[PDB]
């Protein structure tokens, strides 16, 4: 039972910070180029869109943001340390494939997210379909 289990991490590119959330069971990702207020905002707007019940991070930075805890409490997210970067260097390759189609890094990040979530291998389901499948199976 991992419908609402997510992984949260940072990555960096062109001197900017990319927050990345991974739905662990599906591989589905959401990201944004941005501190604690920013992380809390990102988590709230994630949690309004998917079932978000547990978020795992692997360092201490999110345990020291008062707004992040406030977001956790408001939305009912347990923020837990540990495990339930192949994804960040998979996201970075795609960002590289597209970087010249957009003026802003923002945009190239979101095109890369698009491709990651929509792409297949050939057959089966994309990450975007799996997360919907997982959730639909759930209720």
Ligand X SMILES: Cc1ccc2oc(C#Cc3cccc(CN4CCN(CCNC(=O)c5cccc(C#Cc6oc7ccc(C)cc7c6CC(=O)O)c5)CC4)c3)c(CC(=O)O)c2c1
Residues near a second copy (CB under 8 A)? 30, 41, 44-45, 47-50, 74-75, 101, 106-107, 110-111, 113-114, 117-118, 125, 128-129, 132-133, 135-137, 139
Binding of ligand X by 102 (CB under 6 A): yes
> Is residue 53 within 8 Å of residue 4, measured between CB atoms?
yes
List strands edge to edge, sheet with 5-13: 29-33, 16-23, 5-13, 54-57, 78-81
Residue 70 makes CB contacts below 8 A (sequence gap 6+) with 40
Choose among 110, 133, 127: nearest CA to 24: 127
Report the partner that residue 38 touches, choosing among a second copy, ligand X, none (CB closer than 5 to 8 A by kind).
ligand X
59 vs 101 by CB, closer to a second copy: 101
Binding of ligand X by 106 (CB under 6 A): yes
Q: Which residues bind ligand X (CB under 6 A)?
A: 37-38, 40-41, 44, 67, 70-71, 74, 102-104, 106-107
């Amino acid at each position: 039972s991992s419908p609402g289990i997510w992984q949260l991490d940072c990555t960096h590119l062109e001197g900017k910070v990319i927050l990345v959330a991974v739905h662990v069971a599906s591989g589905y990702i959401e990201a944004e180029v941005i501190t604690g207020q920013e992380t809390a905002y990102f988590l709230l707007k994630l949690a309004g869109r998917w079932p978000v019940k547990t978020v795992h991070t692997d360092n201490g930075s999110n345990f020291t943001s008062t707004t992040v805890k406030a977001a956790c409490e408001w939305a009912g997210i347990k923020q837990e340390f540990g495990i339930p970067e192949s994804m960040n260097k998979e996201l970075k390759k795609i960002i590289g494939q597209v970087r010249d189609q957009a003026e802003h890094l923002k945009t190239a990040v979101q095109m890369a997210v698009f491709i990651h979530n929509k792409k297949r291998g050939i057959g089966g389901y994309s990450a975007g379909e799996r997360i919907v499948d997982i959730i639909a199976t759930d209720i």
